[PDB]
Amino acid sequence: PQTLSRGWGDDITWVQTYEEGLFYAQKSKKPLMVIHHLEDCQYSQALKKVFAQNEEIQEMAQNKFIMLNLMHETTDKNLSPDGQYVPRIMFVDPSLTVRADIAGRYSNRLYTYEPRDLPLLIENMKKALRLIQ
């Protein structure tokens, strides 16, 4: 039974599409969080299990971000500037500009996170909340 949350947080109100995400991001002046993943990916499964259950992450996701998760690539090459690996978490500023400066610990997989990177993902969500202005 297909859900929109796909394990990333059932109490988040997820948008369905990138264009919807951008529409609400700009109107509500909130960043958009785009989580790219696959269901048959162990690393995607492990990350979403800890993401779903993290209180601080869930409060930000619910109240400070527009939230989207996808298992197929969008039409925007700016959301995959160093490849289409997953899991891949990109932030988009309300100005519609992708925050390519908000990156995880791996230099050749800049937008991936593993479970041990939760403190860094939390800090990067906060970085995304400090809007381009």
UniProtKB/Swiss-Prot annotation:
Organism expressing this protein natively: Homo sapiens (Human)
Q: Which family does it belong to?
A: Belongs to the AGR family.
Shown portion of the whole protein?
31 to 163 of 166
Q: Which UniProt keywords apply?
A: Endoplasmic reticulum, Signal
Q: Does the keyword Transcription apply?
A: no
**Its biological purpose:** Required for calcium-mediated regulation of ciliary beat frequency and mucociliary clearance in the airway. Might be involved in the regulation of intracellular calcium in tracheal epithelial cells.
- One cellular component term from this protein's GO annotations in UniProt: endoplasmic reticulum
Q: What induces it?
A: Not induced as part of the cellular response to endoplasmic reticulum stress. Up-regulated by androgens and by estrogens in prostate cancer cells Up-regulated by a hormone (estrogen-receptor alpha) independent mechanism in ovarian cancer.
Which compartment or compartments is the protein found in? Endoplasmic reticulum
What name does UniProt use for this protein?
Anterior gradient protein 3
Please describe the organ and tissue distribution of this protein's expression.
Expressed in the lung, in the ciliated cells of the airway epithelium. Expression increased with differentiation of airway epithelial cells. Not detected in the mucous cells. Expressed in ciliated cells in the oviduct. Also detected in stomach, colon, prostate and liver. Expressed in breast, ovary, prostate and liver cancer. Expression is associated with the level of differentiation of breast cancer (at protein level).
Q: Which domain of life is it from?
A: Eukaryota
What is said about its interaction partners and assembly?
Interacts with LYPD3 and DAG1 (alphaDAG1).
Transmembrane segments annotated in the record for this chain: none
Where it mainly occurs, coarsely classed, is endoplasmic reticulum
Offer an example of a GO molecular function term for this protein: dystroglycan binding
| KW Secreted (keyword) present | no
